Symmetry: C3
Subunit: 222 residues, 3 copies
């Protein structure tokens, strides 16, 4: 029953400790499947490992993380309250806190995913960053790309899903909508707030912006 | 004191186990009020139940959830780190992870609320979806509606709050602002990135989009 | 080892209880550094205190919070799953749930930060509110300001970071992009969805909006 399975958790935690994993609290750790690990792995409180998971050397997992059927490279840092399912992280990635990686999430070396970011069937290239308030679905994102806060892939049209491709060295300004299918060429810049409905050339700016105007002495409702 | 109340928690957890609830860890469960439940209910670690809560049959509650004064229908799945207060879920709803339902949140049968979604005094209809990065306040949303990632109800003008009504079979494109009060007719489509300031007719597209343009050889600051 | 350090945690929790702090579960509390507190402080389950932290009187900390090197004024309420690092809260602030305050976050008296909000090197003035789905970086925000859902400071141009200044009594409509450096004068109103690329005068409306239009009988892909 509940109590018996809980005892089995204690057993796994003890064995992990003996195998050289640093568990901050063995009473607040759960493994529901199998865990392979390198050396100097640190796991904080209330972490749940599900399915078949492998961790490299020096991986640090912060409080409250849920990691299911995932492969985590050496030196990765997973910050608090991050949920990871069927994902692969290369070496030296940093994700979270409050990141949500869904199946097909693939991060290349040194990639960063910040708070309130969701990834599904999406690859984030080497040294690339998606720091805030972003949804990346059905997307290929190249190396050295900056995905600005509020960026969203419009991948689903109510019927089908379509693919977004972003080249290397692209800057995606904040609050950009990438309307799939679309391709953004290497070195391109998307202006903040752009709705990208057409492919963008290499080294080109894409923009869809009304010039700002001002009305004086404008009074809000009382 | 602290320790005495903690003992009372152990008691409630034990009684829940005896009554047929599956608690993954009775030592990491809190009930501060009253819990009614059906059969085959599963509650993961670090769940807190507050006030008066009722759960149907086969409800699954993932790690770290906080559920206060709420009614949860049969077969609902509440994913990790979801906060629910004074809400009602019909049968077969799926919410979270990282969903925040505030008082007046009402989900009809089979509704879905995803990550980084907040609902307050808002009804989400049958089979309707709000999957990502969305705020729905003071809103009626019909059946079979797709609420795209980044959608926001602009409900508060600094003085008062106003109501948004969205009909059945509406597609709301990503990053739409619904400027209340506003009504979107059944079958309508809102283009991604639209600022909806006027009512939308049945079976109509609403759009407010600058055509994309491109400037070649555009160099970002060094 | 793990077990020894865990014993030291039990010790600190016991001492906190004896010093008049209400810990909901002393077995689910962690202090990694030093904690100073006033009277009637309440700390819920799975809270982690890191570095050197000071709390005023009547501070309430909800489940799962992580508070590092921060100063929390009297009567503050920190809601569940909120991460706070190198921040200062004045009296009577309310933050979270799912708020993420990074170093340099400074909240003045009675300020509110809601769910899925991130702050970094940003000051939020007296009685000011950032309730939802927002990133505020490198920003000064005055008193009695409403920061609408979906607001983002565009602070980083790929090379450098720039400062946003928002005056007192400003209403920032939902989904506004503040393109730094920029200054918004006292009493100004930013329309929902505006991309603010130019300074805004006192008591002025700033807007960058395509008028909504409609196409009848528009059929989505099958
Ligand atoms: C200071 O930061 C910016 C300035 C700026 O603008 C100052 C523009 S812009 O998009 O308006 N823009 C631009 C883009 C890249 C580099 C420099 C400027 C731009 C585009 C076209 C025109 N005509 C003017 C500015 C964008 C940003 N920053 C972001 O979008 C942040 C992304 C993130 O969250 O990491
Ligand atoms: C591929 O996905 C889209 C394509 C598209 O566009 C391809 C438009 S659109 O809005 O630009 N658009 C449209 C809308 C619905 C169905 C098909 C197209 C549209 C509207 C007007 C015009 N003239 C062209 C396209 C929107 C989306 N998707 C979303 O908005 C995702 C919502 C979510 O997160 O679930
Ligand atoms: C009902 O709420 C609104 C109405 C409205 O609009 C009704 C506009 S508006 O921006 O379109 N607008 C406006 C702004 C402030 C007060 C009243 C109206 C506005 C601006 C210019 C013009 N011409 C018309 C309306 C904005 C809001 N609300 C928000 O943006 C919510 C912010 C939040 O999340 O707290």
């Amino acid at each position: 029953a509940s109590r018996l399975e809980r005892v089995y958790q204690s057993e796994q935690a003890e064995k992990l400790l003996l195998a050289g994993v640093m568990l901050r609290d063995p009473a607040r750790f759960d493994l529901r499947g199998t865990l392979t690990h390198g050396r100097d792995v640190e796991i904080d409180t209330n972490v749940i490992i599900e399915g078949n998971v492998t961790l490299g050397h020096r991986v640090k997992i912060g409080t409250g993380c849920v990691i299911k059927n995932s492969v985590i490279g050496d030196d990765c840092e997973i910050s608090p309250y991050t949920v990871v399912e069927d994902a692969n992280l290369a070496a030296a990635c940093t994700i979270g806190p409050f990141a949500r990686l869904r199946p097909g999430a693939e991060l290349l070396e040194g990639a960063h995913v910040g708070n309130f970011v969701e990834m599904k069937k999406a690859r984030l290239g080497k040294g690339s960053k998606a720091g805030h308030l972003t949804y990346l679905g059905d997307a290929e994102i190249g190396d050295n790309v900056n995905i600005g806060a509020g960026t969203i892939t419009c991948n689903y049209d109510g019927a089908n899903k379509f693919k977004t491709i972003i080249g290397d060295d692209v800057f995606v300004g904040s609050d950009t909508q990438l309307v799939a299918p679309v391709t953004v060429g290497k070195g391109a810049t998307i202006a903040a707030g752009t709705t990208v409905t057409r492919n963008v050339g290499e080294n080109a700016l894409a923009i869809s912006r009304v010039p700002q105007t001002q009305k004086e002495g404008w009074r809000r409702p009382a």
